[PDB]
Design an enzyme around this catalytic site. Structure first.
Site, mmCIF file in Angstrom:
data_model
loop_
_atom_site.group_PDB
_atom_site.id
_atom_site.type_symbol
_atom_site.label_atom_id
_atom_site.label_comp_id
_atom_site.label_asym_id
_atom_site.label_seq_id
_atom_site.Cartn_x
_atom_site.Cartn_y
_atom_site.Cartn_z
ATOM 1 C CG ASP A 5 -1.981 0.999 1.227
ATOM 2 O OD1 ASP A 5 -2.011 1.916 0.400
ATOM 3 O OD2 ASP A 5 -2.853 0.896 2.084
ATOM 4 C CB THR A 6 2.060 3.421 -2.816
ATOM 5 O OG1 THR A 6 0.844 3.661 -3.540
ATOM 6 C CG2 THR A 6 2.756 2.222 -3.455
ATOM 7 N N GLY A 7 -0.210 4.231 -0.411
ATOM 8 C CA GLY A 7 -0.907 5.329 0.230
ATOM 9 C C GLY A 7 -0.863 5.317 1.753
#
Length: 198
Positions: free
Chosen positions: A124-126
Site C-alpha cells: 500500500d503506497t498510500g
C-alpha cells in the site's frame, strides 16, 4: 517517471477545470476525492476504510489528467482526509510496482512471515505505516491512534519487528489493530526497495 517511496507519492491532477494534488494509492480500489464541485448526475455510495465507512457521491465517466496523462473513469467525492487515486485509474496510466514487477489490475497481495506466522498483505503506497489485523506478537507495545478514511482506530505499536515480505527481510514498526486488510506501508516498502513506475 519512476518514483521512490521515501516521501508520499503525490501527483498533480486536473479534474473539472480544477487543479489538485492526490496520492498514488495502490492499496485503494477506488479513486476518492475531497468535496469539490463536479458537474452531472451522481449516486450515493458507501465505502469502507480503516476507521470505518463513509458515504460518497459517485460520478462515472469523469476525465482526469493525472500528471499530464488523460484517463476517464469513476470518481468518488466525499469526506476523505486526502485525495486518493486508486487502482481503477492507476491501471489506465500504466502504473506498475517494482520491488518482481506488478501491474495493478488485481490488488497487489504478497505473503509475509511475521512472528512465526504466515499472512497475506497489501502493498500500500498510500499508507505511511504498516498495520496488521489482531495477531499474536511478543513484546512490549505502545497504544497509538491512526486515522484513515472512516476515521481513527487505536492500534498497538510494536517496534523492531522482523518481517519477511515476499522473501525479503525488513525490520520496523508494525501496528496491530482492527484493520480490515493487512497493509504494508511506506515504512517497510522503502526497505525492500519498492518503486512506482508510470
Amino acid at each position: 517517471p519512476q518514483v521512490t517511496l521515501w516521501q508520499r507519492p503525490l501527483v498533480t491532477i486536473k479534474i473539472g477545470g480544477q487543479l489538485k494534488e492526490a496520492l498514488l494509492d495502490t492499496g485503494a480500489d477506488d479513486t476518492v476525492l475531497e468535496e469539490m464541485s463536479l458537474p452531472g448526475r451522481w449516486k450515493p455510495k458507501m465505502i469502507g476504510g480503516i476507521g470505518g465507512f463513509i458515504k460518497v457521491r459517485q460520478y462515472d465517466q469523469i476525465l482526469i489528467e493525472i500528471c499530464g496523462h488523460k484517463a476517464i473513469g469513476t470518481v468518488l467525492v466525499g469526506p476523505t482526509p486526502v485525495n486518493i487515486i486508486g487502482r481503477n485509474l492507476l491501471t489506465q496510466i500504466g502504473m506498475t510496482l517494482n520491488f518482481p514487477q506488478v501491474t495493478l489490475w488485481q490488488r497487489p497481495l504478497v505473503t509475509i512471515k511475521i512472528g512465526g506466522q504466515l499472512k497475506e498483505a497489501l502493498l500500500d503506497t498510500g499508507a505511511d505505516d504498516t498495520v496488521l489485523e489482531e495477531m499474536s506478537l511478543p513484546g512490549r507495545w505502545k497504544p497509538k491512534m491512526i486515522g484513515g478514511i472512516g476515521g481513527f482506530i487505536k492500534v498497538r505499536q510494536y517496534d523492531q519487528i522482523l518481517i519477511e515480505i515476499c522473501g525479503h527481510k525488513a525490520i520496523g514498526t508494525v501496528l496491530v489493530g482492527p484493520t480490515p486488510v493487512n497493509i504494508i506501508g511506506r515504512n517497510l516498502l522503502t526497505q525492500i526497495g519498492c518503486t512506482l513506475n508510470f
